[PDB]
RNA sequence: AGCGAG
């Protein structure tokens, strides 16, 4: 169970031996503390049975080093087990990283009462299902369990058993009187778990539409009966859910378990979710054994129009050679051609071979459902590896034509093998520096801890929130489940004078999120750490939202530490792909190193006149004012100047601060002319932009946290009268 | 790499003699 | 082998949860399928399996004067308790008028058959109509979906519907590791069985014991004097 | 990190760590100012209600 | 702990060492595969740890100029007559002229086929050249892969990554007592164990006279003899045992070169690393998930995987102020149950059982002021049991060279026949690495149709993302080898196996055969293979075309709704048993200049609760549990021995005070004239 | 192919070119 | 009440433990401060009566105080003041 | 309704291995039941098996005995294949003798009373001019699979080499169902199992111990 | 010095 985890005797013995003497020397097994020492050096039977009373409802913390981030400590109630190895319960896998491939983890034993106590109420895993990171949840069905419930839950339309509305022939013969003749039915060859039937549902809440239109407003459903056009696999499957729980009548992809999980979180109570996704993990598992999912020689189909347009794509390649050959461009030129012609080639080649593969196929079935892989690796496997990444980082324009099913030649692989060595190299190199990062970042925010119930001030940062469309809609910024969730209130939101839509000072979740894109209004004020008029630590409404809990903070939450290492675990994620982009990029930024193209950023309003310098771009900001006209001259011709609704063009009214060429910008700058909140707002979006390339859901709360230690000092050029350089 | 039964052993003999 | 004592746990009046605790090192698992599918399909009972409606020779979308359509009724019907204690099929007659519901109760039973649960709502007769039917009741054995008729010509009439023989309507089973260490992990078989209210779980599983018990004797007479 | 240099400096100007850090109180081993080191639940006290006291 | 990992410990080449770079100044690219290492070192062989590409193989046919680089051969084609001249080039050489790929069409009398071919250049730069204009073709294919990498089937389908993987696990299989040859294989299973110099060979051709287990006597050709005196059980220098059983008897003649005797892992001269095992790649139950591996029972019943790892545990009587040690029964006040084992040396009985906390060498140290003599006899570790293999003693008194002061040493040898037991990490020979999660009896794991239940199951989850499905063809050759088959020659040949060798269209049940790395067992002709394989016993192919077959759920009986891809897989055991890994510690020695814990297995030790562990902690805000994991646990002198006593006791447990090693930071900053001090008022 | 070994085991190889050089 | 029987270390059940107080830092000191109490109870109640008193609810078969004194903060016989 | 009962007709394949066909079962049912037998026999028939040996010149079974080409872990490999058959549960003894050249075979076992070698062909030892082979095994009733009783667990002195014991007669086991389903539901199922043992007892007998186990298992259930 | 997990 979510809550147990096992215990090799040989080491549970050892490590409670303190304990175990006590409970059988008070047994009278022994007669004196010493004697009882050697029955536990000799191992002697009895123990055995003492030993495994004086285990029960005692906390042992498994922890795996790596400890990248705040779960990767968790307590577990200990059951006794035979063998050598610590049985881990599945679920938390993605919790501490693990993969049993020979991975091997500590137990600690927590002795004095209040240990104990913050084994059990803190730490234990089941009151810790959702990340710190981003409320996310860990202990969630993945991998195989996804398998299992995409099997079950899915829908064949022509499988055994299936609901035609028949006439004259016969009745529908397609309903079922309960789910219990369903099972009854599906034992025998009559039913399959992937068809469409009617069945009569009397033990699940139905979706929102049939129970408010049936009965009305108040419908409880423990104990009344309605029609369901389901499959047989998702009435098992939401059995499996809270008896409160809508029907939700899906293919149970994994966003959608995702979503599942998150909703029973947030609404209720821990003890369920727990129990829940236990159950779910064992659907799952007994699930995806009959899926039948398997791979074989025989279920990776090579495209069949692969040789045509390779051939076609290598015609092409030759004509450029040619080209070459010719003088018509030069060796850098013909590199670049043959690699975007490649490039098609591979976009091609991947299309074809996803139109082929049927939806039944075990390889696409895996990727689609969600459990594990990207498409990219399929069409490795079946297609061709595409261009291979020459050491130095260009890309070696051949490229590799051969699939892996089909088998590479020898120079095919020779070529791969650096992409592969240079990937193995940059992740052992990349780990350290994330792992420096993460120190460092825990040791600028460590102070930061919720230290006040509610600072009551007023300012705060706004957030976008969906901005009208140009043509005009409410589209939904992109950036809202890491920007705008988990956040107090700090003003009161009105729509054209209308009524109070939702009121300051109240956590705002997703119904207010709803309330808001329906009310027609985008613009919202939000209570943030940045502005926290607190004297020691930010206090507990400005801070917002815990994940983890998924209510308020505490007044003794360490928030910074969980800051910092959830801005830390995502590294060792992050490739470099001039200005550094990657991990470097964020490590610039934090420790505010100015950056390597110093794009030159706007100082006053008005127009701007451009000219293309010798090897240099002159430009002169007529400042609206009497300013002095700011002019730059010394600006490499190579980088192309910022673009904008135009490539900066001549006139433009660029405000005081806007970057006028495309590059980077020195936070120093940007503070000295516009301001601590433009600096702090454009440092979040910034690093944001950097994790959120590789697809990672961080709240900035934590990024603010760590931008709010950032700007704590001030500098000072008067001297006052008391001791100030 | 260089180098409790007799410590809590002597307090538990003197607690026997009393 | 430490004695597999049976333990039982009611739930509710007609649903229990027996437990059989220490079973042999894997026995648990052969246990627990075997009695399972045979409490399934092992335990004779009797359902409607047939049934005609006055009006209905071509039309299935509903039958005027009642609410209920075709489908509710044998939806329902499905779900109808009756005992039976003659083996070869019987004929059932309802007959309702008049505003109000028809219910379980209405029927006559014959001798030889009764309703187990005779307050049961069918259907919602109404505008001062006539709702008559018959029904064909049959003992078996196990789930037997509806019986395609043969012959058009001989059953004007006959709609024959899937009937739940078995007595007991669901039954599953799991496994534990009681006392793992000093007796090295020996099973534990928990059984999860709900019954529909002719018969107590109690019951259904006494008779699926003693069914398996003469299955197995049968093995069993081969060699009396068998180690 | 530069221990010799923030010792050396600490020294010069006769500085006077307060004992007030997270990362302080877990080198001299006493409770963190976090969780359940603050005062208000680290101070908490518990007591048997009335009826408690008189079931007794 | 094999012959292969000392092969290959040998030809390897180490880029780091005295008067070379180092592992802070190697950068990333020092450590790239530079195209010039085509056929002079190993693309796929390198360490996974901190020495990516620092650590390298030589190939199998480099060779090494006196001036020290690694030329290789190569055959010398001039105007489209690929000859025979295999001569020796530099990278240098190798740059100056143009080299063509080791596999291409050759028309039976050494001209190309094709108009251009595959061909490498100055830089290592890949194109198409005319045909005439080459004038350099490699002897082979697998000619740019080591020792290790060459034996991995189905070489050609797997990522590198994977393929580096398993060439280096390769090095780890622990010496089974079986050691079965394996059922697919390469080419270089036989010349890598001779190479290895396990297996006795024939010096010259001769006669065999006398045939046993402890030696070989063979007549040789003309009157002599020779005698090869066989190493039965000598420890390997990783634990493992270093068996030689001959495999020739009295009436057979010798041919000179010829494998006399099996080593620690080889079968009839073969390499034989693990066993052929038949394997199912379906999902069952869970237990297979996220990497780890389901074994039947039977592995354990019938022994297939078993290693004897055998240790060394020594002491010696010294002679010291006090007093000289001696050895003897004499030991200070003990019971007799505890001397049984010895005999009248003192020392273990060959052969007698020893265990955990049992003696194996009893000592009395002379003791002096304060029995003239204390208590320090060799107990065996703690976890450590088996049998007393043998015991080796040196004696002053017998004039043999010993340390000054030594009267005497004693080397004692314990072997245990470990089992597999759940925990312990298994892998293919394509990096498919994991651990035994749960051994099923043999009742309950899948069937086929006539009841031949799987030995391992396989989670299907790791087969696709970590693109080394050459495993899948591995296990699917493996099935053809194991059942046997027959091409129908009805009408001609099929067209599939056109290119097929004879003795190929035909083969055996259990005929072991061969897939060379780079050129072998292609898709269509695998396919066409299995499409006829001969039924076992009765009219029944159990694997379809498609390979995968009918599995009967053992544990419930039902049939498995769809089909289950099942095979022969090789499988080897790996040194990493749970036996040497598990620990736990609850009080034992302590270090002396900080009075933290000790680390490490070979003492008791604890376990490193570092930094980030802190963080975790601090961040659930668990304030008293950190506090005692830093204070009480570890380092608060005083407070170890009354937790321990309130333990014991079942009072309360104290609070903890001041860390020692705080206060060992304030006397060396004292020490340091740095005036650190402490007030609170 | 031969094997060149006195004593090797008859191992079928699916070889389809020669090797003009042993290891 | 929805859901299923808690058992083990999960029982009492962690949410309805909460409502007692306001943040889980103060339960963990509230049921460890009691458990120290408990302990310090039945080790003492070999010699005269003391100031320390309880268990309040019945315990269980050789269980650790911790699990009493949750079980005791659930049913609701327990009174906390904070610093 | 299906009133029938069932039957148990039996195809003798050969001594070894025989074919059990049981009909008329309900729908659904076969695979059940013949999974059940396939667990019982593969798990619960007991038998008997070599749990330890003894040789006069060797102390362990890391060794050489002189003279024999096999050393004497390959010795007790070689015997693990042993089959036989006890009409005592005492643990019995047998010696094994043999001097000069030649191979050891079972056959050259002499059992005492009740027990006995059903397969005297195996293969042992090879001895030469100078082999000199003295073994004494012990037998005892049994089931299941037993790891290796150690020598300090019981009182045995030095010279005992304990050997994981096999006691399962049964080889392999399988099933086959042939499902009728008729258009007018009149239907079966009709089990064929197919039963193979190591000739240390006939499958009869170990089909009827099976069932034996089974019926006072489930007897307890039933009442 | 070599190795395992990330
Ligand atoms: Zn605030």
Same mark, same amino acid.
């Given at each position: 169970?979510?809550?147990?985890?096992?215990?090799?005797?040989?080491?549970?013995?050892?490590?409670?031996?303190?304990?175990?003497?006590?409970?059988?020397?008070?047994?009278?097994?022994?007669?004196?503390?010493?004697?009882?020492?050697?029955?536990?050096?000799?191992?002697?039977?009895?123990?055995?049975?003492?030993?495994?009373?004086?285990?029960?409802?005692?906390?042992?913390?498994?922890?795996?080093?790596?400890?990248?981030?705040?779960?990767?400590?968790?307590?577990?109630?200990?059951?006794?087990?035979? +063998?050598?190895?610590?049985?881990?319960?599945?679920?938390?896998?993605?919790?501490?990283?693990?993969?049993?491939?020979?991975?091997?983890?500590?137990?600690?034993?927590?002795?004095?009462?209040?240990?104990?106590?913050?084994?059990?109420?803190?730490?234990?895993?089941?009151?810790?299902?959702?990340?710190?990171?981003?409320?996310?949840?860990?202990?969630?069905?993945?991998?195989?369990?996804?398998?299992?419930?995409? &099997?079950?839950?899915?829908?064949?339309?022509?499988?055994?058993?299936?609901?035609?509305?028949?006439?004259?022939?016969?009745?529908?013969?397609?309903?079922?009187?309960?789910?219990?003749?369903?099972?009854?039915?599906?034992?025998?060859?009559?039913?399959?778990?992937?068809?469409?039937?009617?069945?009569?549902?009397?033990?699940?809440?139905?979706?929102?539409?049939?129970?408010?239109?049936?009965?009305?407003?108040?419908?409880?459903?423990?104990?009344?009966?309605?029609?369901?056009?389901?499959?047989?696999?998702?009435?098992?499957?939401?059995?499996?859910?809270?008896?409160?729980?809508?029907?939700?009548?899906?293919?149970?992809?994994?966003?959608?378990?995702?979503?599942?999980?998150?909703?029973?979180?947030?609404?209720?109570?821990?003890?369920?979710?727990?129990?829940?996704?236990?159950?779910?993990?064992?659907?799952?598992?007994?699930?995806?054994?009959?899926?039948?999912?398997?791979?074989?020689?025989?279920?990776?189909?090579?495209?069949?129009?692969?040789?045509? /347009?390779?051939?076609?794509?290598?015609?092409?390649?030759?004509?450029?050679?040619?080209?070459?050959?010719?003088?018509?461009?030069?060796?850098?030129?013909?590199?670049?051609?043959?690699?975007?012609?490649?490039?098609?080639?591979?976009?091609?080649?991947?299309?074809?071979?996803?139109?082929?593969?049927?939806?039944?196929?075990?390889?696409?079935?895996?990727?689609?459902?969600?459990?594990?892989?990207?498409?990219?690796?399929?069409?490795?496997?079946? +297609?061709?590896?595409?261009?291979?990444?020459?050491?130095?980082?260009?890309?070696?324009?051949?490229?590799?034509?051969?699939?892996?099913?089909?088998?590479?030649?020898?120079?095919? &692989?020779?070529?791969?093998?650096?992409?592969?060595?240079?990937?193995?190299?940059?992740?052992?190199?990349?780990?350290?520096?994330?792992?420096?990062?993460?120190?460092?970042?825990?040791?600028?925010?460590?102070?930061? /801890?919720?230290?006040?119930?509610?600072?009551?001030?007023?300012?705060?940062?706004?957030?976008?929130?969906?901005?009208?469309?140009?043509?005009?809609?409410?589209?939904?910024?992109?950036?809202?489940?890491?920007?705008?969730?988990?956040?107090?209130?700090?003003?009161?939101?009105?729509?054209?004078?209308?009524?109070?839509?939702?009121?300051?000072?109240?956590?705002?979740?997703?119904?207010?999120?709803?309330?808001?894109?329906?009310?027609?209004?985008?613009?919202?004020?939000?209570?943030?750490?940045?502005?926290?008029?607190?004297?020691?630590?930010?206090?507990?409404?400005?801070?917002?939202?815990?994940?983890?809990?998924?209510?308020?903070?505490?007044?003794?939450?360490?928030?910074?530490?969980?800051?910092?290492?959830?801005?830390?675990?995502?590294?060792?994620?992050?490739?470099?792909?001039?200005?550094?982009?990657?991990?470097?990029?964020?490590?610039?930024?934090?420790?505010?190193?100015?950056?390597?193209?110093?794009?030159?950023?706007?100082?006053?309003?008005?127009?701007?006149?451009?000219?293309?310098?010798?090897?240099?771009?002159?430009?002169?900001?007529?400042?609206?004012?009497?300013?002095?006209?700011?002019? &730059?001259?010394?600006?490499?011709?190579?980088?192309?100047?910022?673009?904008?609704?135009?490539?900066?063009?001549?006139?433009?009214?660029?405000?005081?601060?806007?970057?006028?060429?495309?590059?980077?910008?020195?936070?120093?700058?940007?503070?000295?002319?516009?301001?601590?909140?433009?600096?702090?707002?454009?440092?979040?979006?910034?690093?944001?932009?950097? &994790?959120?390339?590789?697809?990672?859901?961080?709240?900035?709360?934590?990024?603010?946290?760590?931008?709010?230690?950032?700007?704590?000092?001030?500098?000072?050029?008067?001297?006052?009268?008391?001791?100030?350089? | 790499?260089?180098?409790?039964?007799?410590?809590?052993?002597?307090?538990?003999?003197?607690?026997?003699?009393? | 082998?430490?004695?597999?004592?049976?333990?039982?746990?009611?739930?509710?009046?007609?649903?229990?949860?027996?437990?059989?605790?220490?079973?042999?090192?894997?026995?648990?698992?052969?246990?627990?399928?075997?009695?399972?599918?045979?409490? %399934?399909?092992?335990?004779?009972?009797?359902?409607?399996?047939?049934?005609?409606?006055?009006?209905?020779?071509?039309?299935?979308?509903?039958?005027?004067?009642?609410?209920?359509?075709?489908?509710?009724?044998?939806?329902?019907?499905?779900?109808?308790?009756?005992?039976?204690?003659?083996?070869?099929?019987?004929?059932?007659?309802?007959?309702?008028?008049?505003?109000?519901?028809?219910?379980?109760?209405?029927?006559?039973?014959?001798?030889?058959?009764?309703?187990?649960?005779?307050?049961?709502?069918?259907?919602?007769?109404?505008?001062?109509?006539?709702?008559?039917?018959?029904?064909?009741?049959?003992?078996?054995?196990?789930?037997?979906?509806?019986?395609?008729?043969?012959?058009?010509?001989?059953?004007?009439?006959?709609?024959?519907?899937?009937?739940?023989?078995?007595?007991?309507?669901?039954?599953?089973?799991?496994?534990?590791?009681?006392?793992?260490?000093?007796?090295?992990?020996?099973?534990? %078989?928990?059984?999860?069985?709900?019954?529909?209210?002719?018969?107590?779980?109690?019951?259904?599983?006494?008779?699926?014991?003693?069914?398996?018990?003469?299955?197995?004797?049968?093995?069993?007479?081969?060699?009396?004097?068998?180690? | 990190?530069?221990?010799?240099?923030?010792?050396?400096?600490?020294?010069?100007?006769?500085?006077?760590?307060?004992?007030?850090?997270?990362?302080?109180?877990?080198?001299?081993?006493?409770?963190?100012?976090?969780?359940?080191?603050?005062?208000?639940?680290?101070?908490?006290?518990?007591?048997?209600?009335?009826?408690?006291?008189?079931?007794? | 702990?094999?012959?292969?990992?000392?092969?290959?410990?040998?030809?390897?080449?180490?880029?780091?060492?005295?008067?070379?770079?180092?592992?802070?100044?190697?950068?990333?690219?020092?450590?790239?595969?530079?195209?010039?290492?085509?056929?002079?070192?190993?693309?796929?062989?390198?360490?996974?740890?901190?020495?990516?590409?620092?650590?390298?193989?030589?190939?199998?046919?480099?060779?090494?100029?006196?001036?020290?680089?690694?030329?290789?051969?190569?055959?010398?084609?001039?105007?489209?007559?690929?000859?025979?001249?295999?001569?020796?080039? *530099?990278?240098?050489?190798?740059?100056?002229?143009?080299?063509?790929?080791?596999?291409?069409?050759?028309?039976?009398?050494?001209?190309?086929?094709?108009?251009?071919?595959?061909?490498?250049?100055?830089?290592?730069?890949?194109?198409?050249?005319?045909?005439?204009? =080459?004038?350099?073709?490699?002897?082979?294919?697998?000619?740019?892969?080591?020792?290790?990498?060459?034996?991995?089937?189905? #070489?050609?389908?797997?990522?590198?990554?994977?393929?580096?993987?398993?060439?280096?696990?390769?090095?780890?299989?622990?010496?089974?007592?079986?050691?079965?040859?394996?059922?697919?294989?390469?080419?270089?299973?036989?010349?890598?164990?001779?190479?290895?110099?396990?297996?006795?060979?024939?010096?010259?051709?001769? =006669?065999?006279?006398?045939?046993?287990?402890?030696?070989?006597?063979?007549?040789?050709?003309?009157?002599?003899?020779?005698?090869?005196?066989?190493?039965?059980?000598?420890?390997?220098?990783?634990?493992?045992?270093?068996?030689?059983?001959?495999?020739?008897?009295?009436?057979?003649?010798?041919?000179?070169?010829?494998?006399?005797?099996?080593?620690?892992?080889?079968?009839?001269?073969?390499?034989?690393?693990?066993?052929?095992?038949?394997?199912?790649?379906?999902?069952?139950?869970?237990?297979?998930?996220?990497?780890?591996?389901?074994?039947?029972?039977?592995?354990?019943?019938?022994?297939?995987?078993?290693?004897?790892?055998?240790?060394?545990?020594?002491?010696?009587?010294?002679?010291?102020?006090?007093?000289?040690?001696?050895?003897?029964?004499?030991?200070?006040?003990?019971?007799?149950?505890?001397?049984?084992? #010895?005999?009248?040396?003192?020392?273990?009985?060959?052969?007698?059982?020893?265990?955990?906390?049992?003696?194996?060498?009893?000592? =009395?140290?002379?003791?002096?002021?304060?029995?003239?003599?204390?208590?320090?006899?060799?107990?065996?570790?703690?976890?450590?049991?088996?049998?007393?293999?043998?015991?080796?003693?040196?004696?002053?008194?017998?004039?043999?060279?010993?340390?000054?002061?030594?009267?005497?040493?004693?080397?004692?040898?314990?072997?245990?026949?470990?089992?597999?037991?759940?925990?312990?990490?298994?892998?293919?020979?394509?990096?498919?690495?994991?651990?035994?999660?749960?051994?099923?009896?043999?009742?309950?794991?899948?069937?086929?149709?006539?009841?031949?239940?799987?030995?391992?199951?396989?989670?299907?989850?790791?087969?696709?993302?970590?693109?080394?499905?050459?495993?899948?063809?591995?296990?699917?050759?493996?099935?053809?080898?194991?059942?046997?088959?027959?091409?129908?020659?009805?009408?001609?040949?099929?067209?599939?196996?056109?290119?097929?060798?004879?003795?190929?269209?035909?083969?055996?049940?259990?005929?072991?055969?061969?897939?060379?790395?780079?050129?072998?067992?292609?898709?269509?002709?695998?396919?066409?293979?299995?499409?006829?394989?001969?039924?076992?016993?009765?009219?029944?192919?159990?694997?379809?075309?498609?390979?995968?077959?009918?599995?009967?759920?053992?544990?419930?009986?039902?049939?498995?709704?769809?089909?289950? *891809?099942?095979?022969?897989?090789?499988?080897?055991?790996?040194?990493?048993?749970?036996?040497?890994?598990?620990?736990?510690?609850? *009080?034992?020695?302590?270090?002396?200049?900080?009075?933290?814990?000790?680390?490490?297995?070979?003492?008791?030790?604890?376990?490193?609760?570092?930094?980030?562990?802190?963080?975790?902690?601090?961040?659930?805000?668990?304030?008293?549990?950190?506090?005692?994991?830093?204070?009480?646990?570890?380092?608060?002198?005083?407070?170890?021995?009354?937790?321990?006593?309130?333990?014991?006791?079942?009072?309360?447990?104290?609070?903890?005070?001041?860390?020692?090693?705080?206060?060992?930071?304030?006397?060396?900053?004292?020490?340091?004239?740095?005036?650190?001090?402490?007030?609170?008022? | 192919?031969?094997?060149?070994?006195?004593?090797?085991?008859?191992?079928?190889?699916?070889?389809?070119?020669?090797?003009?050089?042993?290891? | 009440?929805?859901?299923?029987?808690?058992?083990?270390?999960?029982?009492?059940?962690?949410?309805?433990?909460?409502?007692?107080?306001?943040?889980?830092?103060?339960?963990?000191?509230?049921?460890?401060?009691?458990?120290?109490?408990?302990?310090?109870?039945?080790?003492?109640?070999?010699?005269?009566?003391?100031?320390?008193?309880?268990?309040?609810?019945?315990?269980?078969?050789?269980?650790?105080?911790?699990?009493?004194?949750?079980?005791?903060?659930?049913?609701?016989?327990?009174?906390?003041?904070?610093?």
């Amino acid at each position: 169970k979510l809550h147990q985890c096992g215990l090799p005797k040989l080491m549970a013995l050892e490590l409670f031996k303190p304990f175990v003497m006590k409970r059988l020397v008070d047994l009278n097994h022994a007669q004196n503390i010493k004697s009882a020492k050697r029955m536990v050096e000799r191992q002697r039977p009895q123990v055995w049975d003492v030993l495994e009373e004086v285990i029960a409802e005692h906390p042992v913390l498994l922890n795996r080093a790596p400890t990248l981030h705040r779960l990767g400590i968790q307590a577990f109630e200990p059951m006794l087990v035979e +063998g050598k190895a610590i049985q881990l319960h599945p679920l938390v896998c993605e919790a501490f990283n693990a993969d049993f491939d020979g991975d091997q983890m500590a137990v600690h034993l927590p002795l004095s009462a209040e240990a104990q106590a913050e084994a059990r109420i803190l730490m234990l895993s089941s009151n810790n299902i959702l990340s710190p990171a981003s409320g996310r949840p860990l202990a969630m069905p993945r991998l195989d369990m996804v398998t299992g419930l995409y &099997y079950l839950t899915t829908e064949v339309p022509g499988d055994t058993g299936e609901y035609q509305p028949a006439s004259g022939d016969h009745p529908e013969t397609g309903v079922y009187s309960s789910p219990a003749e369903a099972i009854m039915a599906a034992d025998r060859g009559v039913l399959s778990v992937r068809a469409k039937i009617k069945v009569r549902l009397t033990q699940l809440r139905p979706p929102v539409e049939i129970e408010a239109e049936l009965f009305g407003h108040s419908g409880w459903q423990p104990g009344d009966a309605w029609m369901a056009e389901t499959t047989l696999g998702r009435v098992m499957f939401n059995e499996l859910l809270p008896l409160g729980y809508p029907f939700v009548n899906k293919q149970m992809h994994k966003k959608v378990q995702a979503a599942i999980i998150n909703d029973l979180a947030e609404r209720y109570p821990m003890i369920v979710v727990a129990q829940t996704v236990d159950k779910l993990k064992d659907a799952g598992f007994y699930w995806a054994t009959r899926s039948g999912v398997t791979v074989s020689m025989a279920d990776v189909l090579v495209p069949p129009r692969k040789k045509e /347009i390779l051939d076609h794509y290598e015609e092409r390649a030759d004509k450029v050679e040619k080209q070459f050959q010719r003088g018509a461009l030069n060796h850098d030129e013909r590199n670049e051609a043959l690699v975007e012609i490649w490039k098609e080639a591979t976009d091609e080649v991947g299309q074809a071979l996803r139109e082929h593969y049927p939806d039944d196929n075990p390889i696409i079935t895996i990727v689609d459902s969600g459990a594990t892989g990207n498409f990219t690796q399929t069409r490795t496997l079946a +297609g061709m590896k595409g261009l291979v990444t020459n050491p130095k980082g260009e890309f070696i324009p051949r490229p590799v034509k051969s699939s892996f099913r089909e088998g590479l030649t020898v120079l095919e &692989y020779f070529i791969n093998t650096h992409g592969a060595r240079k990937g193995l190299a940059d992740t052992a190199l990349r780990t350290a520096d994330s792992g420096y990062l993460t120190r460092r970042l825990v040791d600028v925010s460590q102070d930061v /801890i919720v230290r006040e119930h509610d600072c009551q001030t007023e300012r705060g940062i706004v957030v976008e929130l969906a901005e009208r469309a140009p043509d005009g809609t409410l589209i939904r910024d992109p950036y809202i489940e890491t920007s705008a969730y988990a956040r107090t209130l700090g003003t009161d939101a009105v729509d054209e004078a209308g009524n109070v839509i939702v009121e300051r000072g109240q956590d705002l979740g997703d119904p207010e999120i709803d309330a808001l894109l329906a009310a027609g209004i985008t613009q919202v004020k939000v209570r943030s750490v940045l502005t926290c008029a607190t004297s020691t630590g930010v206090c507990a409404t400005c801070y917002g939202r815990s994940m983890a809990t998924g209510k308020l903070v505490d007044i003794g939450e360490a928030v910074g530490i969980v800051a910092a290492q959830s801005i830390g675990e995502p590294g060792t994620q992050l490739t470099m792909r001039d200005i550094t982009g990657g991990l470097p990029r964020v490590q610039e930024l934090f420790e505010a190193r100015v950056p390597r193209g110093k794009a030159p950023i706007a100082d006053v309003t008005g127009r701007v006149r451009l000219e293309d310098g010798e090897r240099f771009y002159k430009i002169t900001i007529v400042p609206d004012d009497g300013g002095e006209e700011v002019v &730059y001259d010394k600006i490499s011709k190579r980088q192309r100047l910022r673009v904008f609704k135009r490539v900066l063009s001549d006139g433009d009214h660029v405000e005081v601060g806007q970057q006028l060429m495309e590059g980077s910008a020195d936070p120093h700058e940007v503070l000295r002319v516009q301001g601590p909140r433009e600096v702090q707002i454009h440092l979040v979006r910034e690093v944001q932009e950097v &994790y959120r390339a590789q697809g990672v859901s961080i709240h900035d709360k934590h990024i603010e946290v760590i931008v709010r230690q950032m700007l704590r000092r001030v500098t000072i050029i008067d001297s006052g009268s008391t001791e100030f350089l | 790499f260089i180098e409790a039964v007799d410590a809590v052993s002597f307090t538990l003999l003197q607690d026997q003699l009393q | 082998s430490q004695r597999p004592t049976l333990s039982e746990d009611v739930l509710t009046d007609n649903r229990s949860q027996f437990v059989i605790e220490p079973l042999e090192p894997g026995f648990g698992y052969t246990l627990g399928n075997s009695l399972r599918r045979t409490l %399934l399909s092992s335990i004779p009972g009797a359902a409607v399996t047939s049934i005609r409606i006055d009006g209905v020779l071509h039309e299935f979308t509903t039958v005027p004067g009642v609410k209920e359509d075709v489908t509710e009724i044998i939806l329902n019907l499905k779900s109808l308790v009756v005992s039976s204690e003659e083996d070869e099929p019987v004929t059932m007659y309802l007959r309702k008028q008049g505003p109000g519901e028809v219910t379980a109760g209405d029927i006559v039973p014959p001798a030889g058959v009764t309703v187990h649960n005779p307050g049961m709502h069918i259907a919602t007769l109404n505008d001062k109509g006539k709702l008559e039917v018959e029904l064909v009741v049959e003992r078996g054995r196990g789930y037997v979906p509806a019986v395609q008729n043969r012959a058009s010509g001989a059953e004007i009439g006959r709609i024959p519907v899937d009937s739940i023989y078995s007595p007991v309507l669901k039954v599953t089973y799991k496994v534990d590791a009681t006392r793992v260490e000093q007796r090295t992990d020996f099973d534990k %078989l928990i059984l999860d069985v709900e019954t529909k209210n002719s018969i107590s779980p109690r019951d259904a599983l006494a008779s699926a014991g003693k069914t398996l018990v003469e299955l197995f004797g049968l093995a069993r007479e081969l060699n009396v004097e068998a180690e | 990190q530069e221990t010799t240099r923030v010792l050396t400096d600490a020294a010069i100007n006769c500085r006077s760590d307060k004992l007030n850090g997270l990362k302080e109180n877990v080198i001299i081993g006493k409770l963190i100012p976090a969780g359940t080191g603050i005062n208000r639940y680290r101070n908490i006290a518990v007591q048997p209600t009335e009826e408690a006291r008189a079931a007794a | 702990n094999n012959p292969l990992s000392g092969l290959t410990h040998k030809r390897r080449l180490s880029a780091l060492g005295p008067g070379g770079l180092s592992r802070e100044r190697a950068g990333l690219e020092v450590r790239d595969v530079h195209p010039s290492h085509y056929g002079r070192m190993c693309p796929i062989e390198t360490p996974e740890g901190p020495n990516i590409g620092l650590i390298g193989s030589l190939s199998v046919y480099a060779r090494v100029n006196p001036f020290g680089f690694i030329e290789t051969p190569y055959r010398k084609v001039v105007d489209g007559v690929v000859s025979d001249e295999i001569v020796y080039l *530099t990278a240098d050489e190798e740059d100056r002229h143009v080299v063509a790929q080791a596999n291409s069409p050759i028309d039976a009398d050494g001209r190309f086929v094709e108009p251009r071919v595959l061909v490498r250049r100055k830089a290592g730069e890949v194109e198409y050249v005319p045909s005439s204009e =080459v004038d350099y073709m490699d002897v082979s294919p697998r000619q740019m892969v080591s020792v290790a990498t060459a034996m991995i089937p189905f #070489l050609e389908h797997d990522d590198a990554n994977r393929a580096l993987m398993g060439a280096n696990m390769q090095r780890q299989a622990v010496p089974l007592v079986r050691s079965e040859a394996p059922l697919v294989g390469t080419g270089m299973e036989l010349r890598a164990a001779i190479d290895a110099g396990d297996v006795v060979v024939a010096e010259e051709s001769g =006669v065999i006279e006398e045939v046993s287990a402890d030696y070989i006597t063979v007549m040789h050709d003309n009157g002599t003899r020779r005698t090869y005196r066989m190493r039965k059980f000598a420890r390997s220098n990783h634990g493992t045992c270093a068996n030689q059983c001959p495999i020739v008897d009295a009436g057979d003649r010798v041919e000179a070169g010829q494998v006399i005797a099996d080593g620690p892992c080889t079968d009839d001269g073969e390499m034989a690393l693990g066993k052929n095992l038949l394997v199912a790649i379906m999902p069952w139950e869970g237990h297979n998930y996220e990497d780890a591996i389901i074994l039947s029972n039977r592995l354990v019943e019938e022994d297939v995987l078993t290693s004897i790892h055998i240790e060394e545990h020594e002491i010696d009587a010294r002679d010291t102020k006090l007093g000289a040690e001696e050895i003897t029964r004499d030991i200070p006040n003990i019971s007799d149950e505890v001397l049984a084992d #010895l005999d009248e040396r003192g020392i273990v009985r060959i052969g007698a059982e020893v265990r955990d906390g049992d003696i194996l060498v009893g000592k =009395v140290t002379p003791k002096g002021e304060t029995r003239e003599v204390r208590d320090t006899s060799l107990k065996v570790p703690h976890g450590e049991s088996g049998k007393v293999i043998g015991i080796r003693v040196f004696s002053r008194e017998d004039e043999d060279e010993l340390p000054a002061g030594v009267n005497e040493l004693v080397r004692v040898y314990v072997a245990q026949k470990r089992k597999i037991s759940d925990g312990d990490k298994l892998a293919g020979r394509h990096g498919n690495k994991g651990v035994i999660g749960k051994i099923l009896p043999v009742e309950d794991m899948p069937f086929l149709a006539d009841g031949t239940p799987v030995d391992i199951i396989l989670n299907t989850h790791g087969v696709p993302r970590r693109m080394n499905i050459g495993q899948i063809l591995e296990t699917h050759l493996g099935w053809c080898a194991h059942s046997g088959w027959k091409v129908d020659a009805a009408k001609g040949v099929p067209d599939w196996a056109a290119r097929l060798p004879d003795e190929l269209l035909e083969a055996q049940p259990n005929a072991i055969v061969s897939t060379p790395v780079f050129d072998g067992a292609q898709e269509a002709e695998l396919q066409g293979l299995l499409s006829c394989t001969l039924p076992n016993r009765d009219g029944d192919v159990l694997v379809d075309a498609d390979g995968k077959a009918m599995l009967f759920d053992g544990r419930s009986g039902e049939p498995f709704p769809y089909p289950v *891809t099942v095979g022969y897989m090789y499988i080897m055991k790996l040194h990493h048993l749970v036996d040497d890994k598990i620990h736990a510690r609850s *009080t034992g020695p302590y270090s002396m200049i900080t009075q933290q814990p000790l680390g490490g297995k070979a003492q008791f030790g604890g376990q490193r609760f570092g930094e980030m562990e802190c963080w975790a902690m601090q961040a659930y805000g668990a304030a008293y549990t950190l506090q005692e994991l830093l204070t009480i646990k570890s380092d608060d002198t005083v407070g170890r021995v009354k937790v321990y006593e309130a333990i014991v006791k079942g009072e309360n447990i104290p609070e903890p005070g001041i860390p020692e090693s705080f206060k060992v930071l304030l006397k060396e900053l004292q020490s340091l004239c740095l005036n650190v001090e402490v007030l609170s008022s | 192919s031969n094997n060149s070994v006195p004593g090797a085991p008859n191992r079928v190889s699916f070889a389809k070119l020669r090797e003009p050089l042993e290891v | 009440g929805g859901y299923d029987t808690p058992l083990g270390i999960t029982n009492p059940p962690i949410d309805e433990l909460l409502d007692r107080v306001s943040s889980k830092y103060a339960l963990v000191i509230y049921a460890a401060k009691r458990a120290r109490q408990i302990n310090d109870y039945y080790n003492q109640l070999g010699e005269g009566i003391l100031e320390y008193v309880g268990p309040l609810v019945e315990p269980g078969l050789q269980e650790k105080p911790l699990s009493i004194a949750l079980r005791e903060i659930h049913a609701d016989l327990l009174e906390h003041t904070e610093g």
